[PDB]
Amino acid sequence: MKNINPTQTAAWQALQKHFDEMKDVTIADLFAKDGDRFSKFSATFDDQMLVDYSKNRITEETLAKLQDLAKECDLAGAIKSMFSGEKINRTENRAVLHVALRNRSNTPILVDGKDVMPEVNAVLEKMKTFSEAIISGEWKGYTGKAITDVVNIGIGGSDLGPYMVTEALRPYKNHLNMHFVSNVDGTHIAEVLKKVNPETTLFLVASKTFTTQETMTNAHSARDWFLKAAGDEKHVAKHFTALSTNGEFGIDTANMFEFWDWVGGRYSLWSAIGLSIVLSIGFDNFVELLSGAHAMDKHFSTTPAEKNLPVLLALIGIWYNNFFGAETEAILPYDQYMHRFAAYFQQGNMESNGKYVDRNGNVVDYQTGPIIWGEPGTNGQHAFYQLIHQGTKMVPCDFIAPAITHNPLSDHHQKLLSNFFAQTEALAFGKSREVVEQEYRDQGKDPATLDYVVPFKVFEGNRPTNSILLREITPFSLGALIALYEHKIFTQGVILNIFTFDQWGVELGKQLANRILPELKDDKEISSHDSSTNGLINRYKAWRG
Amino acid sequence: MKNINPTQTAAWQALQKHFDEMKDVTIADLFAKDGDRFSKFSATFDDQMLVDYSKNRITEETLAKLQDLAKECDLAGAIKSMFSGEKINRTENRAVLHVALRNRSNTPILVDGKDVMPEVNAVLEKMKTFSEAIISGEWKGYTGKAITDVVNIGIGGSDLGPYMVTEALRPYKNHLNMHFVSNVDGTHIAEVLKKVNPETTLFLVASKTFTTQETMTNAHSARDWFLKAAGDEKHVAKHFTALSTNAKAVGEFGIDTANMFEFWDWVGGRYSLWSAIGLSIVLSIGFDNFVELLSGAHAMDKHFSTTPAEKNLPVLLALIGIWYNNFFGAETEAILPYDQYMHRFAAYFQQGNMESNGKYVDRNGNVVDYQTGPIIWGEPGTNGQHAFYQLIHQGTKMVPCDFIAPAITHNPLSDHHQKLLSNFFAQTEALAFGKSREVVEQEYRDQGKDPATLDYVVPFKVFEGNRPTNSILLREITPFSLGALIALYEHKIFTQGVILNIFTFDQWGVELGKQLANRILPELKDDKEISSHDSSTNGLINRYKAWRG
């Protein structure tokens, strides 16, 4: 696929001059000029997800020039290269096919001359029939009891998605109690072990590689704990399954749910790694989750760029990331269930596009991926919005909300939504000194005596947002929402000329921690490192317990 | 206190020029030129909290110039003003005295000529008595049973502190099951109410005005569920208390105003866990431990108020942060505790830091033309490491990180802790020093491979390092050590506020959102098409009416 340096193109030069003309233009002005602005800068996916990008510092012209850049970088070809199984993960020489995982239409997708769909579909059928055995109570523990608790053990890609989605979709859950263990910090597994009974608990050891130190440390601790009660290791097979590839660990071959190298960790909840999702909400809802991503995959691969939502959001993201130079993006779902959605995308986005060497192997001199953060509304709202309204850093926000709650109480939801609508309105348009002063007059006060407070109550506004309204958070709509960002992330990586699907940047810390661990196993003064590392290691030895 | 524009000082200018000479200097060279660097760029608080700021892009000279800036801005006077009860919160005309809340020494602190310590101590003695009656099972619910569950209902400062701290200190907890509700999203309260029994559940409604919309919406949904079981509002007093000063509203709710625990307007929300607002902390870990939390904050208070600037940890961190915020222009700071129990620590400081210094008008009423508060984020190690560290090591944004870890775990388990800590050590080492292309090529050669045939990968394995960090090693996370750690950051935030010439203790930026949502709520009730706002607010509101059922 093409490896075009976006900064050296004519479209980039044109975006540069446009930015100079645009940089002080105001969102309030853009709305003042065009009364139908919302209808020109919004679109709806599948009659259920409205994406309103109208409160942005953009004109029809900005989008056109940004579309010129996507075309110059051959975005259309990159998309076709991904969906068809071309081996675009060049540093690892791999296909990138999380789209095959949810390919409900079952069109063949080839890797090394072979259709991947039959194996994709076999693992799924296996997850269905396994989940039925667990959920129905047909599958029994070692003392002949039904499973009540399922404990996922994994880190990164094997943890954030399954945790995020089972939380997001609690309204769809069955009776099984779900736990997600990931930190090597012992408190994580210890806090779980003390709540669960060895005879009714199912562990899933999730790990692309099955070598990860954290996951295997945790899996071994769970194994040990289990055996302290069960006594005999023949019982392990009723209580442990694997989500990976590697068996002497003690897991029945038949208990191994496989996935493939062309499945990135941070794009893996759709595969065998999603079993904890299947066990929590059942196989049908999992398939609904797959179906939603699929419909969004279809939208992305067949919709013309001007009406293509992943592209539009990607392009708007680039305008701020690369022309305004904002470092961050906030993701703010007005939905407590979705309290882990921002966190998931910290890996989805930052591990994909947090890169500095281009597809041609050259260090870049322009910005790559942004820093993703956020908490759900209204929680985030009462923590850190002060800075978003009145700080000195521009933070583009995505506000997300369902029209329908799963927990309707009094007027909670209308109160929740009123903030959803109000915050973006506030961010865009602000509140001038004259309005501030007029409020003080309406109280019979003379604002001239209030210079100590008045200037601090002014909101400059002009702060951009997207708003995403869905009918309701369903497995299907959530599936669609996740993939929407997956493909924004894709689109940004193609344009920024980087490799969105590898992650060599995690290596050095693992290798450095590898050298350090053995040094902790004696009572000796360490001096093989720089003076800081030495200092900290030696103080630890002096203070440890 | 003084309101000096930092950008107009000789110190600011000497820093600008120093940065022009420093901007390309690497941490590797800083460490190679002086083997004693660690010892010159680190200090320990109270024989228990080592703060290592050596892996930073700083020299002795950088620190001298940053100190010069704090002097020119009268940091010392500002500190004396806060601690003495001067009304430094000028936009609201208030004192700023969270230091009084934990002032164990009981030296008088006067506001409007009156010592605040008596009232402070009186609320604490009342929290003590109440907590003992709850914890001991002496206080019975409407059916005569001891309490088993405590649900806190609050937003922002009434939620983040209590929750963060009860989590961080779970090893010190008693038998009480704690719950924290804050979102106006009905899910939040609903998920709690389905897991608790009305006869053994105690609610804490945390809200100074006792009119806060989210909190009172939640409190009222709880009252409703409670009465649907109890059948009589006379039992409210056994199951609801208030952290508030509005006696009229509290009493009307059905709560015995004897169980109104109060605080004062010189207690900011985002500094309120040390007050009445921390009742749930007292209930979860006991009054003894809460007092240890207090004493740890007080020891840090003494440190901040009495240590020379050159060894004053909140000041040093604050200055270093300013070097990156204002001279490097980094937008963010990550707080990364290698401790699962502290998983809400970073989130806590998104408020404490960002609502504090996320400001754009200086203390003289003039709009700033320089950077103020940074954006705070983070997840506990090792989780964040497998999520976002790729961008911190290999992205194009510089992210100063504070790595934090205890040397003792409360959950010892084979070699789990040693592994945890090996990551804590290794990550800052990796970020400071990196890994050259030469080293990468040598690794292949030693495999007997020809790195010339490996162009498709070699360039991508190079770590250019020179990414700064602080490392905070504690003996152990205790109520005391945690009290001091929270206070360290509170005073870092103060120092930055002072220097940056802004108002650290107000939050006028929250008002607009609130007035616009107030206008919008009644419009959500009918089926009328809405056209009272901009086209987009209208469009979203109307789509919502089409889709809501």
Tokens of A399: 């506000």
Q: How far apart are CA B62 and CA B43, in angstroms?
A: 17
Domain spans, chain B: 1-97+292-510, 98-291, 511-549
Gyration radius of chain A's alpha carbons: 26
In chain B, residues with a C-beta closer than 8 Å to the C-beta of A354 are 388, 390-392, 394-395
Query: Which class for B529: exposed (0-12), middle (13-18), buried (19 or more C-beta within 10 A)?
Result: exposed
For chains A and B, what is the number of CB pairs under 8 angstroms?
502
Asked if A502's CB is within 8 angstroms of B419's CB, the reply is: no
Residue showing tokens 């701290």: B165
Q: How far apart are CA A465 and CA A395, in angstroms?
A: 9
Does the domain at B1-97+292-510 match CATH 3.40.50.10490? Answer given as yes
State the DSSP H helix or E strand holding residue B41, giving kind and residue range, or none if neither.
none
Tokens of B66: 């940053």
State the amino acid at position B349 in one-letter form. Answer: F
Asked if B379's CB is within 8 angstroms of A506's CB, the reply is: no
B530 interface with A at CB cutoff 8 Å: no
Q: How far apart are CA B183 and CA B1, in angstroms?
A: 38
Contact B296, B165 (CB under 8 A): no
Q: How far apart are CA B349 and CA B372, in angstroms?
A: 16
A98 is an active site residue: no
Q: How far apart are CA B512 and CA B503, in angstroms?
A: 18
Query: Which class for A170: exposed (0-12), middle (13-18), buried (19 or more C-beta within 10 A)?
Result: middle
Q: Could you tell me what percentage of chain B is helix, strand and coil, using 3-state DSSP and rounding each to the nearest 5? A: 55, 10, 35
Question: Three-state secondary structure along B442-502?
Answer: HHHHCCCCCHHHCCCCHHHHCECCCCCEEEEEECCCCHHHHHHHHHHHHHHHHHHHHHCCC
Task: Find the residue in B nearest to A383 (Cα).
Answer: B351
Asked if B52's CB is within 8 angstroms of A369's CB, the reply is: no
Q: Which of B40, B114, B386, B528 is catalytic?
A: B386
In chain A, residues with a C-beta closer than 8 Å to the C-beta of B341 are 187
Contact B52, B473 (CB under 8 A): yes
Tokens of B489: 């950051």
Tokens of A28: 């309030």
What distance in Å separates residue B118's CA from the closest CA in chain A?
31
Say whether the peptide bond before residue A7 is cis (omega within 30 degrees of 0). Answer: no
CA within 13 Å, CB half, A19? 16
Phi-psi region of A250 (alpha: psi -120 to 50; beta: other; left: phi over 0): left
Q: How many CB atoms lie within 10 A of CB B194?
A: 9
Supply φ then ψ for residue B21, to 5 degrees. Answer: -90, -20
A371 SS3 class: strand
B386 is an active site residue: yes
Asked if A354's CB is within 8 angstroms of B391's CB, the reply is: yes
How far is Cα of residue B204 from the mean position of the Cα atoms in its chain? Answer: 21
Please name every residue paired with B240 in a beta bridge, in sequence order, or none if there are none: B203
Contact B32, B92 (CB under 8 A): no
B84 interface with A at CB cutoff 8 Å: no
Fold of A98-287: Rossmann fold (3.40.50)
Which residues are CB-contacts of A472 (< 8 A; sequence separation ≥ 6)? A48, A402, A403, A404, A406
Topology agreement, domain A1-97+288-506 and domain A507-545? no
B110 SS3 class: strand
Alpha helices in A206-330 (DSSP H): 213-230, 275-281, 283-302, 309-318
In chain A, residues with a C-beta closer than 8 Å to the C-beta of B93 are 452
State the amino acid at position A303 in one-letter form. Answer: T
What's the CATH code, domain A507-545? 1.10.1390.10
In chain A, residues with a C-beta closer than 8 Å to the C-beta of B461 are 504, 507
Residue showing tokens 């392009």: A315
Q: Which of B310, B318, B404, B348 is nearest to B49 (CA)?
A: B404
**Residue among A220, A414, A531 minimizing CB distance to B36:** A531
Q: Which of B175, B194, B248, B514 is catalytic?
A: B514
Angle B186-193/B213-230 helices, nearest 10 degrees? 30
B 257-316 residues with CB below 8 A of A? none
Please name every residue paired with A472 in a beta bridge, in sequence order, or none if there are none: A404
Q: Which of A167, A351, A375, A486 is catalytic?
A: A351
Q: Which of A17, A40, A145, A510 is catalytic?
A: A510
Asked if A515's CB is within 8 angstroms of B375's CB, the reply is: no
CA within 13 Å, CB half, A126? 21
Asked if A520's CB is within 8 angstroms of B155's CB, the reply is: no
Which residues are CB-contacts of A54 (< 8 A; sequence separation ≥ 6)? A37, A38, A40, A41, A42, B535, B536, B539
**Residue among B350, B429, B520 minimizing CB distance to A422:** B520
Asked if B339's CB is within 8 angstroms of A405's CB, the reply is: no
Q: How far apart are CA A365 and CA A368, in angstroms?
A: 9
| Terminal alpha carbon distance of chain B | 57
Q: Could you tell me what percentage of chain A is helix, strand and coil, using 3-state DSSP and rounding each to the nearest 5? A: 55, 15, 35
Q: Which of B277, B261, B281 is nearest to B269 (CA)?
A: B277
Instruction: Kindly give the pairing relationship between strand B42-45 and strand B49-52.
Output: antiparallel
Instruction: Kindly give the pairing relationship between strand B114-115 and strand A42-45.
Output: unpaired
Query: Which class for A115: exposed (0-12), middle (13-18), buried (19 or more C-beta within 10 A)?
Result: middle
Q: How far apart are CA A473 and CA A288, in angstroms?
A: 12
Question: A44, A91, A397, A421: which to substitute to probe chain B, counting the most B Cβ within 10 Å?
Answer: A421
A509 interface with B at CB cutoff 8 Å: yes
Q: How far apart are CA B257 and CA B414, in angstroms?
A: 51
| Terminal alpha carbon distance of chain A | 55
Fold of B98-291: Rossmann fold (3.40.50)
Q: Which of B167, B355, B379, B441 is catalytic?
A: B355
Residue showing tokens 């040598």: B442
Q: How far apart are CA A417 and CA B523, in angstroms?
A: 11
In chain A, residues with a C-beta closer than 8 Å to the C-beta of B412 are 186, 545
Query: Which class for A65: exposed (0-12), middle (13-18), buried (19 or more C-beta within 10 A)?
Result: buried
B534 interface with A at CB cutoff 8 Å: yes
State the amino acid at position B440 in one-letter form. Answer: V
Q: How far apart are CA B514 and CA B518, in angstroms?
A: 6
CA distances from A416 to A378, A392, B507 (A): 7, 27, 21
**Residue among A353, A422, A502 minimizing CB distance to B517:** A422
In chain A, residues with a C-beta closer than 8 Å to the C-beta of B379 are 343, 346
Say whether the peptide bond before residue B211 is cis (omega within 30 degrees of 0). Answer: no
Which residues are CB-contacts of A423 (< 8 A; sequence separation ≥ 6)? A377, A381, A385, A399, A465, B513, B516, B517
State the DSSP H helix or E strand holding residue B18, giving kind and residue range, or none if neither.
helix B10-22
B61 is an active site residue: no
Q: Which of A382, A412, A415, A445 is catalytic?
A: A382
Q: Which of B72, B21, B22, B63 is nearest to B42 (CA)?
A: B63
Please name every residue paired with A240 in a beta bridge, in sequence order, or none if there are none: A203
Tokens of A52: 């309103």
CA within 13 Å, CB half, A234? 3
Does the domain at B511-549 match CATH 3.40.720.10? Answer given as no
**Domain spanning A1-97+288-506, CATH architecture:** 3-Layer(aba) Sandwich (3.40)
Contact A265, A98 (CB under 8 A): no
B 341-400 residues with CB below 8 A of A? 341, 347, 350-351, 354-355, 357-361, 365-368, 370-377, 379-397, 399
Q: Which of B377, B424, B169 is nearest to A185 (CA)?
A: B424
CA distances from B464 to A140, B398, B401, B428 (A): 53, 12, 17, 13
**Residue among A417, A455, A503 minimizing CB distance to B524:** A417
Q: How far apart are CA A292 and CA A114, in angstroms?
A: 26
DSSP assignment letter at A351? I
Instruction: Kindly give the pairing relationship between strand B149-153 and strand A397-404.
Output: unpaired
A123 SS3 class: helix
